Amino acid sequence: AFIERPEDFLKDKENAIQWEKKEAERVEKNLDTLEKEALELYKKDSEQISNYSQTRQYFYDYQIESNPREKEYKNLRNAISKNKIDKPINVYYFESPEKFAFNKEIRTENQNEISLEKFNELKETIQDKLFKQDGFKDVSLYEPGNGDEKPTPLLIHLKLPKNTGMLPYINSNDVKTLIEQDYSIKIDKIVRIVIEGKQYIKAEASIVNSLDFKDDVSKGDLWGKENYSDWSNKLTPNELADVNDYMRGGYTAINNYLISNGPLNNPNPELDSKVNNIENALKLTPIPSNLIVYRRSGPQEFGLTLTSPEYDFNKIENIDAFKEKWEGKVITYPNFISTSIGSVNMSAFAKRKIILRINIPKDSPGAYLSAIPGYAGEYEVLLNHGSKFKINKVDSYKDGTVTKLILDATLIN
């Protein structure tokens, strides 16, 4: 009955429903065959479907296409963006606080009551963290009250941007909203609220946009070249000579010199004078926008060996152990740090088990190295040595029989 919905329906279930049905009717009429069919498969099987869309991009390209589940993903993706929003909107869903890297427990099932203690902990575990968000999910258009399901004590109030794709669809008797998460989320403010005489945490979240090419290494390359082609040259007469040093086939000399501290223990101006430039090579054209990149990392970077038993993530204790040790913490890299713009696996590191997913703020030290020709063919972004990264979150997925880690991180500097 609104002619144009408000930006936030707040507690007003009845109007939100009245507007979304009208909208669900419209939009469904615009789906094609494959799209509807996709929707019809989501309803019947949404958990397994969402799971797939969370961790879809980490396999080899050919493992991605050859997936019986990828057909459906692509179709549901298309469906979702078919209808991009109007203008911004606010949505409501519940999370598990696990999701935010709070592995403890707000207050259990039967308590209707939330510790000031636990509450402050939470506020602390999520303040100044971005948390990357991926995969399909159902969201609601108004705040829950008496009558609505309320499965967790954690309630997320999210402001979707002007252009988000959003699918309102009928399912038996109610109206549901489908979205594809693709951004990271900052929590600005969390407050305690009550509903049906019960206590719940309410998180105010906003989207910080970063570019993320995931498996579309092509899309990525175009971007990369679009920024780093005039850089290939621009880099001046003495940095030009120096640049072609890490990018001279062998890096286990230039890193290995930085790892076990060469600088102020072992000084060797034959590489220092190399570095003070190979560093300014990256500082030539700093990153032109918030960019996600992917590093596949090996056991050393996390104080283990190939053979360490605490590296077997097929056993959850080791995950739980890994998380205690790393989640929340900020790690520093003495090495130039070598990432790719695309999440796909590859022969050079086919078997590495720690994926580092890095959000890089706009304006930071780096470069699309893969913009030189010849050298060309792995979509590499180099990050400046002495970089520090904040590990906000540890996820995991099965890759074949081998379990791996996805570390959601932000480059602080």
Partner: protein, 360 residues
Amino acid sequence: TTALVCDNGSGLVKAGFAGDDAPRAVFPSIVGRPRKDSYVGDEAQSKRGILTLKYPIEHGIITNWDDMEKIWHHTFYNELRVAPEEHPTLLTEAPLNPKANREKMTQIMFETFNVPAMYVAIQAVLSLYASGRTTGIVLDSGDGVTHNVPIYEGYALPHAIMRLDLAGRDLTDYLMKILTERGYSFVTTAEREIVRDIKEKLCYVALDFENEMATAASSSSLEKSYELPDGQVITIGNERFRCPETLFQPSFIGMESAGIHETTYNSIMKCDIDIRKDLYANNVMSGGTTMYPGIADRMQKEITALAPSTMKIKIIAPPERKYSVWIGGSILASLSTFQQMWITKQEYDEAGPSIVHRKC
């Protein structure tokens, strides 16, 4: 007069005259200075004490031009014994050689050694050519690096080239490692050359690594004897194949990269689908490190098991293999129709060093 083929690897240099069927000059790619001031080749191993050994080529890319120079110099005069000026010169180069090296190879060859003509061919290509083909996939594995190099119609395909920093050098170190874990001790830089020899004499790839392990652990039949320079004898067992196994399972050596069979399928798969058929049926193996008995049959198995069951798989691995990049060099350089393809000094002296960019 008669052309020249000089194949520059990270361990060995293979060098000779076009049209012969084997390199006359085969010698180590090392330059020695001390703490009077320059030594190359063998009479730099000889020397090892007074001087410090550098390998000018690292992982098949040229990393110190000043030493290459010495290398190339020794080659012409101390080795082949001719003069840069009387002979044209074919040179090889690793895949994904950056534009500047190629460029710098030119000047130095012209503006220093002063050669009427020269050419530069990618290594894997020549190696494919020596076996009569011009489309197919080369596993080229040398002393410091191995490459899966998919080629169609004479052109290497860079997007799909697969590179792997793990070769015979590393396979020797590991042989040194696990031999030591056994009783024996290997320590010097001149004691290594001994294991290197064992490796070449005694290792072999197992058709099926587990059955090898178990046959090894439960009987004596697999155990070869080696005879040290003077007197003593070492005995070697499952090391005999644990070593080249690394190739299929780099984890052996603490690397988490894919192995030889997987990077082949990987490289094939980054290629246009229409051509995959021909890659599979034209898998040519080349390089010192491909010389393990058993290697062809294992590739053929590990590959068979990754590719579509309808696929036809062929693993070509001639005995002349170790020196094939050279041979294809000599074939190429001796060919009547090729003569109008060199880059001549008049070609260089005039138009720039940017000429070498010979994508046909």
